[PDB]
């Protein structure tokens, strides 16, 4: 699993796949392993570990990050067997703290670090980062509504919702997030009270929200990152 | 200028064909 995790066979601007479904099959076995577990193992080699992890969410391939967390949900299966201060329930506890915090919680720049990295890039790396509206720069990327692979998922996932709610109303821009949700809505607000758009939103929490209520079910193939992060989320385990 | 490089990158980085293309097209013609 170190090879198949090497930039050069799996970069994330020249990611062959290949790589990507070796590595997921890999990580799907230990899937069966975790399940498996009434034969005991080392806890080293149970943990796929940092240097993978950080490395897997470093890439954006939505199979990837639904592999991922579908690996976490059974690493979670075998995580209460073990005491909370160990290192190797400590780390996982770090990637679950950082996944939801990148995905959903939004609070990414108060963060020590997102995936080992410190914010102070993320306010510098967009400087020379041409972005429409700039009122936003940082709140885009933590949100997988702009959290690019998944960014163009939630445009999908946003449609059917309109579609399957009827709404005469539409989300005016293509790509999800903050502004582009709340634009549309003060030119609408005086008749969104009523009706015209999604009734389960007023906000954009809830949009986020209610784009993973389509993912808590069994017909999307990327149902599992919403899922597994209910679990800790308290708010979006209510919702689901 | 925006950072097409970073300021303590720019600083050993040659500048020049961006601030005159001359530098540049030199060499294309």
Redesign the interface.
């Known amino acids: 699993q170190s090879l198949l995790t090497l930039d050069k066979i799996f970069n994330n601007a020249t990611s062959n796949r290949f790589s990507t479904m070796a590595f997921i099959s890999s990580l799907d076995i230990l899937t069966q392993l975790s399940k498996q577990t009434k034969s005991d193992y080392a806890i080293q080699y149970l943990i796929v570990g940092p240097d993978i992890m950080n490395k897997v969410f470093s890439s954006d391939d939505p199979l990837l990050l639904s592999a991922a967390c579908r690996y976490l949900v059974a690493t979670k299966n075998k995580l209460m067997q073990y005491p909370s201060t160990n290192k190797f329930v400590r780390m996982q506890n770090q990637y679950i703290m950082d996944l939801t915090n990148y995905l959903y919680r939004n609070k990414v720049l108060s963060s020590k670090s997102l995936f080992g990295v410190s914010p102070d890039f993320f306010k510098?790396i967009l400087?020379?980062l041409y972005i429409p509206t700039a009122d936003f720069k940082n709140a885009k990327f933590f949100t997988i509504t702009g959290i690019p692979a998944l960014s163009y998922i939630c445009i999908i996932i946003l449609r059917r919702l309109e579609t399957a709610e009827n709404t005469k109303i539409k989300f005016t821009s293509g790509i999800i997030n903050e502004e582009t949700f709340n634009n549309f809505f003060r030119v609408h607000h005086d008749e969104i009270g009523q009706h015209g758009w999604i009734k389960g939103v007023n906000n954009i929490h809830d949009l986020r929200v209610k784009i993973l209520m389509h993912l808590s079910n069994t017909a999307n193939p990327y149902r599992d990152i919403a899922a597994f992060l209910f679990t800790y989320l308290k708010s979006l385990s209510k919702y689901s | 200028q925006?950072?097409?490089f970073?300021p303590g990158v720019a600083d050993l980085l040659d500048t020049d064909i961006l601030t005159s293309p001359s530098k540049r097209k030199r060499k294309l013609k």
Do not use: G, P, V
């Open positions: 510098q400087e020379n | 925006h950072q097409m970073d």
